[PDB]
Amino acid sequence: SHHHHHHSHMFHYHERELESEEGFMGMYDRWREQHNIEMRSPERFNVFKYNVRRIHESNKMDKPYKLKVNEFADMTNLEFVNTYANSKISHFQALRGSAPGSKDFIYANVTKIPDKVDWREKNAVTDVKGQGGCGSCWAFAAVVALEGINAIRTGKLVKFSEQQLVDCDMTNAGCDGGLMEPAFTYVIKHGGIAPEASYPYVGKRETCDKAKIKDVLKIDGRQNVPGLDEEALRKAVAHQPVATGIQLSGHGLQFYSEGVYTGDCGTEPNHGVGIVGYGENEKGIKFWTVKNSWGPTWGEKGYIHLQRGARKEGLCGVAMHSSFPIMN
């Protein structure tokens, strides 16, 4: 639309299909076929119409991001969040760790950092993975940061094992959730992390198998980024990918397709992610580039650009509990 000035794997539909039950049923059957969904019912059709109407209405608003009628269109946001964003980061942080913002931060004294950073362009980021229903986002987030530090130093990009963390790290709660900081402690104290090729992901906690732990990446330390400080977070991201918690609730996040996400978001992280970059789009909107673990069909081939500088806690609580491994 002419008057829109904040903007500039996709399911196509015509607005006319929303005007009748027949058009909506035809759209629903076409959506099911394109996403390889066989399951249909009056209730799922009802959820589909509710979500599509919200997606359609959201896309008529002037904002720098778009939503798409993805494969999660027949899920209510409550079912979606309970299945895919249930790693309990804020919950375990309150039970185990410190409030956000509280040896010193290794990047504290850095003054000169680039305006734009994209670790994907520097062979420090592996392909997007799929976590499934398992509340193991803390292990995926820790692994993004470990794959990052290893590749920056050695020049060889190796996928590391989330499964080893899920099975072996007894300080965390496996598929029930956990935290990145103790996952890094586990890697330091218990001998290192094996490549994915040696300890593959199964999406459920199994017996810790010592035979699969070989050709390990060893690290020396880890630290938290000083919380509630997006500038301190920018200093750490300029040096390496950072593991952080984010809250991914709301229809805006279930259906996020592209652009800089500036929508509603809470400050109770429930999903671990890796921050692999930052920048500013052509319209002056500052962002973080976040690697998610919902596969390549969600967002921009599995990524989300989140608004940077939105609030003290960062948008979606991105700057509350961030941490990174050290190899000194």
From Swiss-Prot:
Q: Where is the active site?
A: 137, 271, 292
Q: Name one GO molecular function term.
A: protein homodimerization activity
**What are the residue ranges of the propeptide?**
11-96
Enzyme Commission code(s) on record:
3.4.22.-
Which parts of this chain are annotated as the region B-cell epitope. Binds to IgE of the patients allergic to ragweed pollen?
155-168
Say which enzyme class the record assigns. Answer: hydrolase
| Known tissue expression | Expressed in pollen (at protein and mRNA level).
Q: Disulphide bridges in this chain?
A: 134-175, 168-208, 265-316
| Activity profile over pH | Optimum pH is between 8 and 9.
From its record, what is one biological process in GO terms? proteolysis
Sorted keywords for this record are: Allergen, Autocatalytic cleavage, Disulfide bond, Glycoprotein, Hydrolase, Protease, Signal, Thiol protease, Zymogen
PTM description: Autocatalytic proteolytic cleavage of N-terminal activation peptide. N-glycosylated. Glycosylation is not required for binding to IgE.
Question: Which residues are glycosylated according to the annotation?
Answer: 109
Describe its function. Answer: Cysteine protease. Hydrolyzes casein and synthetic peptide Boc-Val-Leu-Lys-7-amino-4-methylcoumarin (Boc-VLK-AMC) in vitro.
Q: Assembly state and interactors?
A: Homodimer.
Task: Report the family membership.
Answer: Belongs to the peptidase C1 family.
Q: What is this protein called?
A: Cysteine protease Amb a 11.0101
Where does this protein come from, organism-wise?
Ambrosia artemisiifolia (Common ragweed)
Highest lineage ranks of the organism? Eukaryota, Viridiplantae, Streptophyta, Embryophyta, Tracheophyta
